[PDB]
Design a protein around this ligand. Structure first.
Ligand SMILES: Nc1nc2c(ncn2[C@@H]2O[C@H](COP(=O)(O)OP(=O)(O)O)[C@@H](O)[C@H]2O)c(=O)[nH]1
Length: 202
């Protein structure tokens, strides 16, 4: 988190991760369109010649303060086909919570498994353990006839009873349930004072 004492805001970074075309943009856009205009920034896309980043922030009005501070959530993803692994490494810098979005189609199951391993390795390369940070998994595209059962999704992707949410992102099914779950894990960590605290005088 980035705790800005001037604004009295705790800024938490939630990264949506998963294979290309699995539904990350759709999650972010659905959330963005169902967030109060007065609470949110612009929806921002940063494009290079190849890879892109999509993100926005918002300050939910329902949330109480944590020891005098409000919590602002920043949602980040690298959407679409990824050309540089470095892009997925960079998106994880400063992460506070992760949503892994799995594409439930059988044809994408190997891509899901590769992306989940890539997430664990890229986190570890920057000193994060996926087992020690707020993390939820979304089984997206439940509407498609080639979507594998939750049982098969879990056998392939979830061996630690990670909180799991079924989603159909374009219609919003499961989208807020997923976000609420990871946000609650992040907030619980903040309230208990868990994690490593660094004091900067910049
Ligand atoms: N049928 C179906 N299509 C989906 C679902 N979620 C995303 N899509 C479609 O899959 C494509 C890729 O989604 P997108 O969110 O851009 O993927 P990203 O690369 O992970 O950001 C788009 O055409 C979406 O409309 C879903 O739950 N069901």
């Amino acid at each position: 988190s980035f705790i800005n004492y001037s604004s009295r805001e705790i800024n938490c970074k939630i990264v949506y991760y998963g294979p290309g075309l699995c539904g990350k943009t759709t999650n972010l856009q659905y959330i963005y369109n169902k967030t109060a205009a007065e609470t949110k920034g612009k929806l921002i896309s940063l494009s290079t010649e190849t890879d892109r980043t999509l993100f926005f922030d918002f300050l939910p009005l329902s949330l109480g303060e944590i020891r005098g501070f409000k919590t602002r959530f920043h949602l980040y993803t690298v959407p679409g086909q990824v050309f540089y692994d470095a892009s997925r490494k960079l998106i994880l810098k400063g992460v506070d919570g992760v949503v892994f979005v799995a594409d439930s189609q059988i044809e994408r199951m190997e891509a899901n498994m590769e992306s989940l391993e890539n997430l664990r390795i890229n986190l570890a390369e920057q000193g994060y353990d996926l087992n020690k940070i707020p993390y939820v998994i979304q089984y997206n595209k439940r509407d498609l006839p080639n979507a594998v059962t939750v049982e098969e999704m879990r056998k392939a992707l979830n061996h630690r009873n990670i909180p799991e949410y079924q989603a159909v992102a374009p219609t919003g099914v499961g989208v807020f349930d997923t976000l609420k779950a990871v946000a609650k894990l992040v907030l619980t960590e903040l309230k208990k004072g868990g994690g490593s605290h660094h004091h900067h005088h910049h």
